[PDB]
Amino acid sequence: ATFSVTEGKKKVPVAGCRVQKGQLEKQKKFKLTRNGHVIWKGSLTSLKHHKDDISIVKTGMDCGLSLDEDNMEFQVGDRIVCYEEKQIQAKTSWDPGF
Amino acid sequence: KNVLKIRRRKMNHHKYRKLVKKTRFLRRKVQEGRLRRKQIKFEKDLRRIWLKAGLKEAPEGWQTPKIYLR
RNA sequence: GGACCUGGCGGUGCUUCAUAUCCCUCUAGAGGAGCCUGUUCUGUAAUCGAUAAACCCCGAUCAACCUCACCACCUCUUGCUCAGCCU
RNA sequence: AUGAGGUGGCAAGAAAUGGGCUACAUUUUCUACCCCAGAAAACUACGAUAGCCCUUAUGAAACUUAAGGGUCGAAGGUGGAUUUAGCAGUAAACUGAGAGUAGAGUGCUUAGUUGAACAGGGCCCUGAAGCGCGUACACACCGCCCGUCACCCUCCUCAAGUAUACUUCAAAGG
RNA sequence: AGUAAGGUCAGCUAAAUAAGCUAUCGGGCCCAUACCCCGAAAAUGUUGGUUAUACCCUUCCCGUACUACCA
Ligand SMILES: *C(=O)[C@H](CCSC)NC=O
Ligand SMILES: [K+]
Ligand SMILES: [K+]
Ligand SMILES: [K+]
Ligand SMILES: [K+]
Ligand SMILES: [K+]
Ligand SMILES: [K+]
Ligand SMILES: [Mg+2]
Ligand SMILES: [Mg+2]
Ligand SMILES: [Mg+2]
Ligand SMILES: [Mg+2]
Ligand SMILES: [Mg+2]
Ligand SMILES: [Mg+2]
Ligand SMILES: [Mg+2]
């Protein structure tokens, strides 16, 4: 469900989501998924559950999700995949033959 | 005679006086620190005279005055 | 760079003027309407030139074809010209 | 083929602008006359040379060019800012001819008729002449030229903290 | 969403005669471009009732102020 919350004279679209597999963390980056397409890439502006801010929601926990990008449109069936990004040392592809 | 050589100096002085009014607060800091090295360089010259004359400490009852104050 | 010369200019001075002239002054007009006509924009596959005074019923005392240089299509090759070209 | 020839064809008008013609009428309109007249006269008036329809003329060819007739009877009711011409047989108004074309202009050239008003007082303006002044202009006042704010390029200075390097010491005393 | 106060031309201000000044458009002025000078366009958010007229009343629309309220 998509909710419109009025805080500070600003309409905040809130995406109500149900965690199916895994957990969501405030720090870890997110991306929006529409029927397999990738709509958005970024971090949540506010993670708030049951009127209480929770950093880590476990599997099966209900959580309302608001993005920092107001242009993002939330539908009834959109999917969201959270992910953790770690920089990895890259080695040169050049092999000299020995 | 014309004043084409005065008009060149007219703007030079105007631009210089307008730059000092814009940087007047930074110039007060530089001059204060420029007067601290000038006084310490004066204290080093006097300390070279009694160290090269064979003494170890300044003559009794001698204090180097701050000659770069207001 | 200094000092001169000439010329131009000056919201530069004096004086004297402008006779259809700068202004006021006399007379009929223009800009207002409709039409004719030219030009500029726009448009079209579809000329050119003039274009402040000193262009704008100007070249044209003049375009239905011709004029015609323009456009489209077709055609010819020592070709009206001891060539030709409004390039 | 940037040459030559043939067939067909476009040259329009949302808009703006210049010049001109005709008018908004009663000093007029129509008729007779060519200056002693009678009518008209505001929603059947004044006023289109436009539109539409027909005919005719020229021409091989005309909704198309021009003329005429018929129908039609609009705007317009005297024109903002500004602006043009003209010193006398002139302006204004009226009339005719001609060039050029097969034909074609409200255009041009030209002949004639009737026939005015102001003309005087000034020096900002437009412009001139004479004697002057000034001038950094000379592609000449649409001239020349001064500063702020930009990329790029070049050099210099200041400067916090720190680091390196160099210099001096015995040219001394016990 | 409610409650309060509200609504002009592109803006704004007066009047309800709908005008004035900017913005816009075109013309004029100049050598030309500005300024400037002239003209034209532009409506009273909407429904009617209501009255000279909408300035009154009402319908609906939008925003303003505040609050309810919502992950
Ligand atoms: C919001 O409160 C959230 C909505 C879930 S919609 C299935 N629920 C719990 O925090
Ligand atoms: K001179
Ligand atoms: K007139
Ligand atoms: K006219
Ligand atoms: K005219
Ligand atoms: K008549
Ligand atoms: K500059
Ligand atoms: Mg200088
Ligand atoms: Mg032409
Ligand atoms: Mg032909
Ligand atoms: Mg040719
Ligand atoms: Mg009649
Ligand atoms: Mg007729
Ligand atoms: Mg002929």
Side-chain angles (χ1 to χ4, degrees), chain A residues 32-49:
Chain A
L32 181 62
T33 294
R34 262 186 187 174
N35 201 18
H37 303 281
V38 180
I39 303 299
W40 190 65
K41 278 263 186 181
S43 184
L44 294 160
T45 189
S46 185
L47 169 54
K48 184 165 172 165
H49 149 62

Side-chain angles (χ1 to χ4, degrees), chain A residues 62-77:
Chain A
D62 295 1
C63 58
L65 298 193
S66 58
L67 310 186
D68 188 3
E69 189 79 357
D70 205 349
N71 302 322
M72 291 303 125
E73 272 187 3
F74 311 108
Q75 303 297 340
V76 181

Side-chain angles (χ1 to χ4, degrees), chain A residues 20-90:
Chain A
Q20 300 181 341
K21 55 183 67 178
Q23 54 173 16
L24 310 183
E25 302 182 6
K26 179 59 181 180
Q27 294 177 336
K28 302 308 184 195
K29 292 160 177 173
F30 298 85
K31 68 179 178 186
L32 181 62
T33 294
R34 262 186 187 174
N35 201 18
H37 303 281
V38 180
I39 303 299
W40 190 65
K41 278 263 186 181
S43 184
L44 294 160
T45 189
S46 185
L47 169 54
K48 184 165 172 165
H49 149 62
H50 185 62
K51 299 182 179 181
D52 295 332
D53 192 320
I54 184 171
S55 299
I56 309 180
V57 289
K58 280 82 177 184
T59 300
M61 188 77 67
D62 295 1
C63 58
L65 298 193
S66 58
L67 310 186
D68 188 3
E69 189 79 357
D70 205 349
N71 302 322
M72 291 303 125
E73 272 187 3
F74 311 108
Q75 303 297 340
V76 181
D78 303 334
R79 293 177 183 260
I80 297 179
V81 182
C82 180
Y83 55 89
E84 168 173 9
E85 294 216 318
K86 177 190 169 192
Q87 275 186 352
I88 311 300
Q89 175 55 35

Side-chain angles (χ1 to χ4, degrees), chain B residues 44-56:
Chain B
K44 282 181 181 175
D45 185 25
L46 297 197
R47 177 173 184 268
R48 173 195 58 91
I49 279 178
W50 75 57
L51 280 180
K52 184 168 177 294
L55 297 178
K56 313 300 178 182

Side-chain angles (χ1 to χ4, degrees), chain B residues 1-4 7 11 15 30 34 37:
Chain B
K1 190 190 178 190
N2 61 22
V3 301
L4 271 170
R7 289 182 51 80
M11 183 65 62
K15 290 187 61 178
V30 170
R34 194 177 275 170
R37 298 193 301 264

